[PDB]
Short mmCIF file of C-alpha atoms and ligand atoms in Angstrom, two decimals:
data_model
loop_
_atom_site.label_atom_id
_atom_site.label_comp_id
_atom_site.label_asym_id
_atom_site.label_seq_id
_atom_site.Cartn_x
_atom_site.Cartn_y
_atom_site.Cartn_z
CA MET Q 13 46.65 163.47 20.02
CA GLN Q 14 44.20 162.23 22.61
CA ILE Q 15 44.53 163.61 26.18
CA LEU Q 16 43.34 161.37 29.00
CA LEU Q 17 43.03 162.41 32.64
CA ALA Q 18 43.46 159.90 35.48
CA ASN Q 19 40.76 159.62 38.17
CA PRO Q 20 41.22 160.15 40.98
CA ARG Q 21 44.08 162.63 40.82
CA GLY Q 22 45.31 165.70 42.65
CA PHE Q 23 44.38 166.92 46.15
CA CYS Q 24 43.63 164.47 48.87
CA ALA Q 25 41.78 165.23 52.16
CA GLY Q 26 44.90 165.73 54.20
CA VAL Q 27 46.55 168.17 51.73
CA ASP Q 28 43.37 170.25 51.34
CA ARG Q 29 43.00 170.47 55.16
CA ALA Q 30 46.69 171.38 55.71
CA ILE Q 31 46.69 174.16 53.11
CA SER Q 32 43.47 175.55 54.60
CA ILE Q 33 45.01 175.54 58.04
CA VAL Q 34 47.87 177.79 56.89
CA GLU Q 35 45.56 180.07 54.77
CA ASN Q 36 43.14 180.44 57.69
CA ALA Q 37 45.93 181.15 60.16
CA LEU Q 38 47.19 183.89 57.86
CA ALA Q 39 43.76 185.45 57.62
CA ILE Q 40 43.12 185.25 61.37
CA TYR Q 41 46.50 186.23 62.81
CA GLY Q 42 48.17 187.93 59.87
CA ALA Q 43 51.75 187.47 58.72
CA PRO Q 44 54.06 185.99 59.58
CA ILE Q 45 52.87 182.43 60.14
CA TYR Q 46 55.64 179.94 60.75
CA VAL Q 47 55.33 176.50 59.24
CA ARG Q 48 57.62 173.59 60.07
CA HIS Q 49 58.58 172.18 56.69
CA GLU Q 50 56.75 172.81 53.38
CA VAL Q 51 53.12 172.42 54.40
CA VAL Q 52 52.72 170.03 51.44
CA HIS Q 53 55.39 169.12 48.88
CA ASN Q 54 54.30 171.43 46.10
CA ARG Q 55 56.38 174.39 44.86
CA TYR Q 56 53.31 176.30 43.51
CA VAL Q 57 51.46 176.05 46.87
CA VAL Q 58 54.55 176.78 48.95
CA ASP Q 59 55.66 179.75 46.79
CA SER Q 60 52.17 181.21 47.03
CA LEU Q 61 51.94 180.85 50.79
CA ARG Q 62 55.33 182.50 51.09
CA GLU Q 63 53.82 185.42 49.15
CA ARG Q 64 50.97 185.78 51.71
CA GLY Q 65 53.45 185.73 54.64
CA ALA Q 66 54.06 182.10 55.58
CA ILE Q 67 57.68 181.37 56.67
CA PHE Q 68 58.86 177.74 56.19
CA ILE Q 69 61.53 176.45 58.59
CA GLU Q 70 63.11 173.09 59.41
CA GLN Q 71 64.02 173.68 63.03
CA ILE Q 72 62.08 175.20 65.91
CA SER Q 73 65.17 177.35 66.81
CA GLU Q 74 64.33 179.37 63.67
CA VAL Q 75 61.04 180.46 65.21
CA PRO Q 76 60.85 183.57 67.45
CA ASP Q 77 59.12 183.50 70.82
CA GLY Q 78 55.43 184.53 70.76
CA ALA Q 79 55.07 183.17 67.20
CA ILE Q 80 52.38 181.00 65.64
CA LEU Q 81 53.74 177.64 64.37
CA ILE Q 82 52.00 175.11 62.14
CA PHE Q 83 53.37 171.56 61.73
CA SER Q 84 53.24 170.33 58.06
CA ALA Q 85 50.91 167.60 56.84
CA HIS Q 86 53.80 165.08 56.96
CA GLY Q 87 53.95 165.16 60.75
CA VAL Q 88 56.71 165.79 63.28
CA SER Q 89 58.55 163.83 65.89
CA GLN Q 90 57.69 163.95 69.60
CA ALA Q 91 61.07 165.74 70.10
CA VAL Q 92 60.04 168.48 67.71
CA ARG Q 93 56.60 168.68 69.27
CA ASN Q 94 58.02 168.92 72.78
CA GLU Q 95 60.64 171.50 71.74
CA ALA Q 96 57.76 173.55 70.34
CA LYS Q 97 55.80 173.02 73.58
CA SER Q 98 58.78 174.03 75.76
CA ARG Q 99 58.88 177.33 73.83
CA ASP Q 100 56.34 180.12 74.14
CA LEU Q 101 54.73 179.25 70.76
CA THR Q 102 51.07 179.00 69.68
CA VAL Q 103 50.88 175.69 67.80
CA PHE Q 104 48.50 174.35 65.20
CA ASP Q 105 48.96 170.86 63.84
CA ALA Q 106 48.30 170.23 60.14
CA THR Q 107 49.57 166.63 60.30
CA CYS Q 108 47.16 164.52 58.28
CA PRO Q 109 44.89 162.32 60.44
CA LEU Q 110 46.07 159.25 58.47
CA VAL Q 111 49.68 159.96 59.50
CA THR Q 112 48.67 160.61 63.13
CA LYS Q 113 47.02 157.15 63.14
CA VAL Q 114 50.39 155.52 62.46
CA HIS Q 115 52.11 157.76 65.06
CA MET Q 116 49.75 156.53 67.77
CA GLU Q 117 50.69 152.93 67.11
CA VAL Q 118 54.43 153.62 67.19
CA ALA Q 119 54.03 155.48 70.56
CA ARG Q 120 52.11 152.48 71.92
CA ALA Q 121 54.93 150.02 71.03
CA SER Q 122 57.45 152.49 72.54
CA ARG Q 123 55.49 152.63 75.84
CA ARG Q 124 55.63 148.83 75.90
CA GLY Q 125 59.34 148.59 75.17
CA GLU Q 126 58.43 146.41 72.22
CA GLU Q 127 60.25 146.79 68.88
CA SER Q 128 58.69 148.16 65.73
CA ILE Q 129 59.75 148.24 62.13
CA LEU Q 130 58.80 151.08 59.75
CA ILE Q 131 58.67 150.54 55.98
CA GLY Q 132 59.63 153.82 54.34
CA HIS Q 133 62.23 156.03 52.66
CA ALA Q 134 65.11 157.34 54.76
CA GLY Q 135 65.29 161.15 55.03
CA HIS Q 136 61.68 161.84 54.24
CA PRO Q 137 59.95 164.11 56.81
CA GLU Q 138 57.07 161.68 57.41
CA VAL Q 139 59.59 158.90 58.19
CA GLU Q 140 61.50 161.24 60.54
CA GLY Q 141 58.23 162.09 62.32
CA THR Q 142 56.99 158.47 62.61
CA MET Q 143 60.39 157.09 63.68
CA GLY Q 144 60.43 160.06 66.08
CA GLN Q 145 57.38 158.65 67.94
CA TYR Q 146 59.63 155.86 69.42
CA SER Q 147 61.85 156.69 72.45
CA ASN Q 148 62.18 153.51 74.51
CA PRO Q 149 65.83 152.25 74.68
CA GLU Q 150 64.68 148.81 75.98
CA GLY Q 151 62.91 148.20 72.64
CA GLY Q 152 63.78 149.44 69.21
CA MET Q 153 62.60 151.26 66.10
CA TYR Q 154 64.02 150.12 62.76
CA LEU Q 155 63.64 151.43 59.23
CA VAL Q 156 63.54 149.14 56.17
CA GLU Q 157 63.21 150.32 52.62
CA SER Q 158 63.33 147.02 50.74
CA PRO Q 159 63.29 143.19 51.11
CA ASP Q 160 67.11 143.27 51.19
CA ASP Q 161 66.91 145.50 54.27
CA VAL Q 162 64.61 142.96 55.90
CA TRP Q 163 67.00 140.10 55.03
CA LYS Q 164 69.74 141.88 57.00
CA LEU Q 165 67.79 143.11 60.04
CA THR Q 166 68.15 141.49 63.43
CA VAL Q 167 65.98 142.45 66.41
CA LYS Q 168 66.13 141.78 70.13
CA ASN Q 169 62.83 139.98 70.48
CA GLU Q 170 61.03 138.89 67.35
CA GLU Q 171 58.25 137.39 69.50
CA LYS Q 172 57.08 140.95 70.23
CA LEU Q 173 57.47 142.76 66.94
CA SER Q 174 55.13 145.02 64.97
CA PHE Q 175 55.33 146.98 61.70
CA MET Q 176 54.03 150.27 60.26
CA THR Q 177 54.43 151.98 56.91
CA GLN Q 178 54.81 155.36 55.28
CA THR Q 179 51.50 156.56 53.90
CA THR Q 180 52.74 157.31 50.34
CA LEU Q 181 54.60 154.13 49.36
CA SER Q 182 54.38 152.05 46.20
CA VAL Q 183 51.56 149.55 46.89
CA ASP Q 184 53.35 146.82 44.98
CA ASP Q 185 56.82 147.33 46.47
CA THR Q 186 55.43 147.49 50.02
CA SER Q 187 53.72 144.18 49.43
CA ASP Q 188 57.16 142.65 48.66
CA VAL Q 189 58.63 144.15 51.83
CA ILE Q 190 55.80 142.81 54.00
CA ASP Q 191 56.17 139.35 52.46
CA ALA Q 192 59.78 139.42 53.48
CA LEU Q 193 58.97 140.64 57.02
CA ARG Q 194 56.49 137.77 57.53
CA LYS Q 195 58.95 135.14 56.27
CA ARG Q 196 61.75 136.48 58.45
CA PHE Q 197 59.57 137.25 61.52
CA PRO Q 198 56.60 134.89 61.45
CA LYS Q 199 55.11 136.42 64.69
CA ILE Q 200 55.24 140.02 63.41
CA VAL Q 201 52.03 142.00 63.90
CA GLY Q 202 50.66 144.82 61.75
CA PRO Q 203 47.51 146.19 60.19
CA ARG Q 204 45.50 144.02 57.81
CA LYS Q 205 47.59 145.24 54.89
CA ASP Q 206 49.66 148.43 55.47
CA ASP Q 207 49.38 152.13 56.36
CA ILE Q 208 49.38 153.32 52.73
CA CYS Q 209 46.43 155.74 52.61
CA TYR Q 210 43.32 155.65 50.42
CA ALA Q 211 44.61 158.61 48.30
CA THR Q 212 47.95 156.85 47.49
CA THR Q 213 46.29 153.56 46.69
CA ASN Q 214 43.66 155.26 44.52
CA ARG Q 215 46.08 157.43 42.59
CA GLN Q 216 48.34 154.46 41.89
CA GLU Q 217 45.38 152.37 40.69
CA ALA Q 218 44.27 155.28 38.51
CA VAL Q 219 47.72 155.82 36.94
CA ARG Q 220 47.90 152.09 36.24
CA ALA Q 221 44.65 152.36 34.22
CA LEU Q 222 45.89 155.55 32.56
CA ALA Q 223 49.22 153.99 31.54
CA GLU Q 224 47.51 151.03 29.91
CA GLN Q 225 46.06 153.56 27.39
CA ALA Q 226 48.65 156.35 27.17
CA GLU Q 227 52.07 156.09 25.55
CA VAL Q 228 53.32 158.99 27.68
CA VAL Q 229 52.23 159.98 31.19
CA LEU Q 230 52.74 163.43 32.74
CA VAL Q 231 52.53 163.54 36.52
CA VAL Q 232 51.95 166.96 37.98
CA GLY Q 233 53.93 167.10 41.19
CA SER Q 234 57.07 168.49 42.73
CA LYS Q 235 60.42 166.64 42.88
CA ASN Q 236 60.27 166.19 46.65
CA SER Q 237 56.71 164.75 46.64
CA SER Q 238 57.05 161.07 47.55
CA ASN Q 239 53.56 160.09 46.42
CA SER Q 240 53.96 161.97 43.12
CA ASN Q 241 57.26 160.15 42.33
CA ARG Q 242 55.50 156.82 42.92
CA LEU Q 243 52.96 157.71 40.18
CA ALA Q 244 55.65 158.45 37.54
CA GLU Q 245 57.63 155.38 38.66
CA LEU Q 246 54.58 153.12 38.24
CA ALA Q 247 53.91 154.30 34.69
CA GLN Q 248 57.62 153.94 33.84
CA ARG Q 249 57.73 150.35 35.09
CA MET Q 250 54.78 149.66 32.75
CA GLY Q 251 57.12 150.74 29.91
CA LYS Q 252 55.64 154.14 29.26
CA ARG Q 253 57.67 157.35 29.18
CA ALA Q 254 56.59 159.27 32.31
CA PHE Q 255 57.66 162.70 33.48
CA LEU Q 256 57.22 164.36 36.82
CA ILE Q 257 56.59 168.08 36.23
CA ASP Q 258 55.73 171.16 38.28
CA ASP Q 259 53.84 172.96 35.52
CA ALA Q 260 53.18 173.28 31.81
CA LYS Q 261 56.49 175.10 31.21
CA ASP Q 262 58.38 171.89 31.97
CA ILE Q 263 56.83 170.05 29.02
CA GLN Q 264 59.38 169.39 26.25
CA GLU Q 265 57.80 169.01 22.75
CA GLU Q 266 59.86 165.88 22.01
CA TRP Q 267 58.07 164.02 24.80
CA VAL Q 268 54.73 164.21 22.96
CA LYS Q 269 55.64 164.65 19.26
CA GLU Q 270 53.67 162.19 17.13
CA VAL Q 271 52.23 160.63 20.27
CA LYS Q 272 48.65 159.46 19.75
CA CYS Q 273 47.67 159.23 23.40
CA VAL Q 274 49.07 161.25 26.28
CA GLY Q 275 47.89 160.79 29.87
CA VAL Q 276 47.90 163.34 32.71
CA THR Q 277 47.59 162.87 36.43
CA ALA Q 278 48.62 164.74 39.54
CA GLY Q 279 50.05 163.87 42.93
CA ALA Q 280 48.08 164.39 46.13
CA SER Q 281 49.74 167.80 46.77
CA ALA Q 282 49.21 169.36 43.26
CA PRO Q 283 46.42 171.94 42.73
CA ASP Q 284 43.99 171.36 39.89
CA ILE Q 285 44.88 174.64 38.17
CA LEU Q 286 48.33 173.17 37.36
CA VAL Q 287 46.60 170.25 35.62
CA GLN Q 288 44.35 172.67 33.68
CA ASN Q 289 47.47 174.55 32.51
CA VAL Q 290 49.17 171.31 31.50
CA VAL Q 291 46.12 170.35 29.44
CA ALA Q 292 46.15 173.76 27.79
CA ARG Q 293 49.80 173.27 26.79
CA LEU Q 294 49.17 169.79 25.40
CA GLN Q 295 46.31 171.26 23.37
CA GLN Q 296 48.53 173.87 21.86
CA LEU Q 297 50.81 170.94 21.01
CA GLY Q 298 48.04 169.17 19.08
CA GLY Q 299 45.92 167.59 21.71
CA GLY Q 300 42.11 167.69 21.68
CA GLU Q 301 39.53 167.78 24.48
CA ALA Q 302 40.72 166.27 27.77
CA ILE Q 303 38.84 163.03 28.56
CA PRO Q 304 38.50 161.97 32.20
CA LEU Q 305 38.82 158.23 32.75
CA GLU Q 306 36.20 156.60 34.94
CA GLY Q 307 37.33 156.10 38.49
CA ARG Q 308 36.85 155.38 42.21
CA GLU Q 309 34.76 158.21 43.71
CA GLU Q 310 36.51 159.67 46.82
CA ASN Q 311 34.35 161.18 49.54
CA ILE Q 312 36.55 161.73 52.62
CA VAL Q 313 37.13 165.25 53.94
CA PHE Q 314 39.07 166.36 57.02
CA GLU Q 315 37.90 169.63 58.60
CA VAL Q 316 40.30 172.32 59.92
CA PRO Q 317 40.34 172.68 63.72
CA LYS Q 318 37.50 174.84 65.08
CA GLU Q 319 40.12 177.33 66.37
CA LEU Q 320 40.95 178.13 62.74
CA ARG Q 321 37.53 178.19 61.10
C1 H6P M 1 51.49 164.75 53.75
C2 H6P M 1 51.64 163.56 52.88
C3 H6P M 1 51.38 163.53 51.53
C4 H6P M 1 50.81 164.59 50.64
O1 H6P M 1 51.70 164.84 49.55
P1 H6P M 1 53.14 165.57 49.68
O2 H6P M 1 53.67 165.60 48.25
O3 H6P M 1 52.88 166.85 50.33
O4 H6P M 1 53.97 164.63 50.69
P2 H6P M 1 54.69 163.24 50.33
O5 H6P M 1 53.92 162.39 49.30
O6 H6P M 1 54.81 162.58 51.68
O7 H6P M 1 56.08 163.63 49.83
C5 H6P M 1 52.25 162.37 53.59
O8 H6P M 1 51.00 161.66 54.13
S1 SF4 M 2 48.52 161.47 50.98
FE1 SF4 M 2 47.20 160.34 52.40
S2 SF4 M 2 48.04 160.41 54.42
FE2 SF4 M 2 49.15 161.94 53.08
S3 SF4 M 2 47.96 163.89 53.44
FE3 SF4 M 2 47.02 162.88 51.77
S4 SF4 M 2 45.36 161.74 52.54
FE4 SF4 M 2 46.76 162.15 54.30
#
């Protein structure tokens, strides 16, 4: 059995920065360090940080006065941010810069009382945070997940309408949503394409290349990782069996028995050691040396704030 590795895969700039923020805060201030939401959606990372004294909460009420609070990489709403500010908390923000970029646009449309539409998945923390940048009752902030949602949406003033997107969406499905938005609201304004980040686009392009070679694709990533689910989904739609797994223990022999080519990738929040362990397991199941596919070289890095270096 041949083992192929997708490239790029694994950690993106925003996840590496966010994890460093929490590690550095723990080393500087000691435990406990409060974190609003899993810093990144990865069980291995989260479980480990818990070990070192990080405490993950959903609501600011959960945090004691005098505490240190870090916002997760997914971002938070202005209401959350203000609630944190109204309290006597020391705050560090691990929101990824590429999410903050979207937030700034939503706040701008809110200040203008002009409606905005967000393409994204209801209930996800990044969508809650981005929708939570809009607070003007004169205008409006609407969420759409699909072309059908667009077909049913009505707005107050489609002459002054703009759109944004979640950073981890399917590139192909978002394209379909945007097409619908432009047919329904011909004066709608947005970025040149969407707000899907370089890491999402690159990992989806890389899994596409991987799936054209592999019969089975294993995506290292947790269940609640949006970007990771998009990678397994993409390979599945190409007709390959694809499994989203947290670690090597999740691999069932049947998935790879008599398979000549198995591919492995990882979501933006999965540490490389999990991939190494998955490769090791596939080897014990008959696989040979892991072969990295050629891919887009990534070079962006986001530094931690000076206050935490
Ligand atoms: C922070 C972030 C992505 C990094 O991966 P995560 O798996 O942590 O988050 P997501 O894909 O949104 O479920 C959203 O920009
Ligand atoms: S997936 Fe993209 S936007 Fe999200 S943390 Fe990573 S680099 Fe930032």
